[PDB]
Design a protein around this nucleic acid. Structure first.
Ligand SMILES: [Zn+2]
Ligand SMILES: [Zn+2]
Ligand SMILES: [Zn+2]
Ligand SMILES: [Zn+2]
Lengths: 81, 81
DNA sequence: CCAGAACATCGATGTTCTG
DNA sequence: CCAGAACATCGATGTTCTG
């Protein structure tokens, strides 16, 4: 099969560095679209949801927060090292 | 009293006794679809998310439970007028 | 190699309509 | 008045190309 190198904010099979963190494709555009305005979402739980290839589309509030945490930031490759 | 505006499972405008319970189109529909379809409903938290006009898309696993909880039955007494 | 656009594709959901 | 059915929407997530 494939081995594995899991994305820093779900756990899917990562694609490359995205806006600064090893994330998959989805985390890639999810974060971009979230950041580019209006990320007002409410959590249905107590601000700590679990994540993964499925549960990830359950709560954008938490996913966006997990992006932020991983380090994902808009002008990543501008500075890299 | 008892008719009463608020959806018993997501407090939006209810439309009438749907499947047992005063409820809305969405939930109405959601219940049937829930009970006779294939799905991967899993909750990201610890199965007690708030269902609400918005969040109710977050945890269908939780909604469906709220459904079951509130009485909604498929093969049930069709009434309310 | 990563950014960001086009498409195209589904499953989930929602509303209006019609028996 | 309600079940169900027929639309019609939303939103994720491919894939595939640029620069
Ligand atoms: Zn991811
Ligand atoms: Zn959450
Ligand atoms: Zn409802
Ligand atoms: Zn839940």
């Amino acid at each position: 099969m494939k081995p594995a190198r899991p994305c820093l904010v779900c756990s899917d099979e990562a694609s490359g560095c995205h806006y600064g963190v090893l994330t998959c494709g989805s985390c890639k555009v999810f974060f971009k679209r979230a950041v580019e305005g209006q990320h007002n979402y409410l959590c249905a739980g107590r601000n700590d949801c679990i994540i993964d290839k499925i549960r990830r589309k359950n709560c954008p509030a938490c996913r966006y927060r997990k992006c932020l945490q991983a380090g994902m930031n808009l002008e990543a490759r501008k500075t890299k090292k």
